[PDB]
Amino acid sequence: NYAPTPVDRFTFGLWTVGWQGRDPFGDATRRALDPVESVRRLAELGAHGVTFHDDDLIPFGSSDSEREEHVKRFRQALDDTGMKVPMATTNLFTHPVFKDGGFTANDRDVRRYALRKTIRNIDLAVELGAETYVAWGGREGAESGGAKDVRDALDRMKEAFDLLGEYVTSQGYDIRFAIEPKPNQPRGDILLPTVGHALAFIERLERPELYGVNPEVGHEQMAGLNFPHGIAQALWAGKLFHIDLNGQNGIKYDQDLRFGAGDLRAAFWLVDLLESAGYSGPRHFDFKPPRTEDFDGVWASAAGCMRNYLILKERAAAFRADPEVQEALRASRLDELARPTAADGLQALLDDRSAFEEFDVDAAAARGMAFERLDQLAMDHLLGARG
Template sequence: MTEAYFTGVERIRYEGPDSDTPLAYRWYDPDRMVLGRRMADHLRVAVCYWHSFCWPGSDPFGGGTLDRPWMRAGDPVALAETKMDVAFELFEKLGAPFFTFHDRDVAPEMGSLRETQATFARLTERLQGCIERSGVKLLWGTANLFSHPRYMAGAATNPDPEVFACAAAQVRDALEATHRLGGVNYVLWGGREGYDTLLNTDMARELDQLGRFLTMVVEHKHKIGFTGTILIEPKPMEPTKHQYDHDVATVYGFLKRYGLEREVAVNIEVNHATLAGHSFEHEVATAQALGIFGSIDMNRGDPQNGWDTDQFPNDHVELALPMARILEAGGFTTGGFNFDAKIRRQSVAPDDLLHAHVGGIDTLARALLAGARLVEDGRLRSLRAERYAGWKGDLGQRLLGGLDLAGAADAGLGLDPRPRSGRQEMLENLVNRLV
């Protein structure tokens, strides 16, 4: 490793809520115990290779604005090495316990798949060294099956089986690398598994291809002894008009269809939730209700723009309730909070990357404390339970158990239940007293 990229900055430290140091944590105090667990072990924060080191600041109307040394002309492998060093410099300066990566983030596309494979092998070996030296762990790996033109019409769902095979080659390698590097999850995001027009699309066939692919991945996981979680990341649209992994409920139906609902969980991204017309909390609640909650891609969208803005989170109030929900269900097992977030295109100073992550991590920490207060207070939980208390009574039990429709109907005919207040405003105030 050569000289520092983030010059003039040492490891970010916790200084407490009153600190006015721009690059210090005010809320993220990794060893602080929250509900019996270290804050760091609750949050399992991961920094994302992709957004922070591979995106040049381009958008659909303009080229890159971020002048990174490793994006200039040069030997692609040497540039990838520089990038890796700077990435670990960031991970370490932030004190982030985890990172996440796509195969193509750490190793470039070469002339052929075989060459690309070889380069990936060499660079993941180097990655292993960085992991060992730094102590930063791998939350999950994944394969980029969306950037190369060969995937323009899908990877597993491509009309051309050769593309399916290429995707298999990438995923096999990325999954095995993840296993080798000690990763605790493996993610599939199907950015091209969808359609631009139904005119040329056979949806039933494509769903079967996707089910087949996922089945292969699950079988391979068991074969190689990978004990991490396989995660699907739902997203409704973008880059295609429609993606099959639309939202959590859709993914659940897909998993049930192919008998995979006990093998695969979801990686919920905040901005993908809102693009699908759901609140983030809704997606978490749905995954919990359906038993497929896995991990989180933490970011935020713009409520007025209709694309994936992938901004860093900055409102702990908004995140307090989802956090409480996750805590109540016992927190993460293999999952964590991965910052699938990018700085704005105008944030061209190197330290903008630091500000973004420090702010994001602090927002999570503050939301964790607020969520823990909600859980400890317990009133939300008990008021909710009380609302359904009638179901523990005789009628409730018989409705769930013995009665058929006629029996239930006969029971109903003599009743005239009175509306009870849902207490929404009172509950909102209760939350506000605690966050």
């Protein structure tokens, strides 16, 4: 039961199942995986595709001949399995040169290098068929208030993204960009810390249509925010270009638990929203099998990500299709929320005594919302306890 299919579009970063287990306090617990191994194992589990940072696929500093051989082996694995590569990204965070940032490093020479590193990988992403290029500015930020003038940093970040947009336009590429917010870690505070801040920034770019967001479940939850609500705002703006699925158990370090772990009810409401809205992009997992696990546990954790999505999809669909739930949604006036407040227009509203002089506020205030019964139907559907 709950078997993944190609139409599910489940994807995984090479760095997810390939995470060797090094953490702030501990050495690696697993050997490095050849990307070819990961592609073949993920395909066996029913994944649709993989994603990569440049330096996951090609060791940093590789010669041109080494780069060609790494890509050739990877493409053979994709061909052997039918796996796709819908998204790629640049590693602008691991190498010590990026310790103060890539696009917003105080040092101008580093900013220029970061752009050249990204541009090289955009070319590769396009060659592999990627539709989305993600940017997670994990080093853009500060530990102290004097270190980073944020208005200047935002000017540099806009300049960088504008140059990348000029580049893809000039090359005729169809790829689009997705900015991944995170509030903190590894920097004390990271620039564009939430979906909202990223959406606002995009509106000030020269070609805003080329940019959207790649929200990650755990990153919004690291600020205590409601991830389904943030996804709704991204969908409302037309900017949900990609998504990163995982779990996070409260406000703390980025845990990258398998999807469905952490906040299970938020996972249910997320899947309900994505499916109801008809989100058509990859269901991408950015997770880390805990360092307690051997390789069998790695593959079990990856399988669990997909299984949990499929269980939640079933339960959310059953919730929405249940005539008792539809009745409860009407009892709670969800239908009215979807109707315009004043399609009659401003003057008619101003002239409408039913909206002011004749509005019976005490009668309105007496009406219960019936939200608790609706939520208990949702709980019963999630748990398969209807009756």
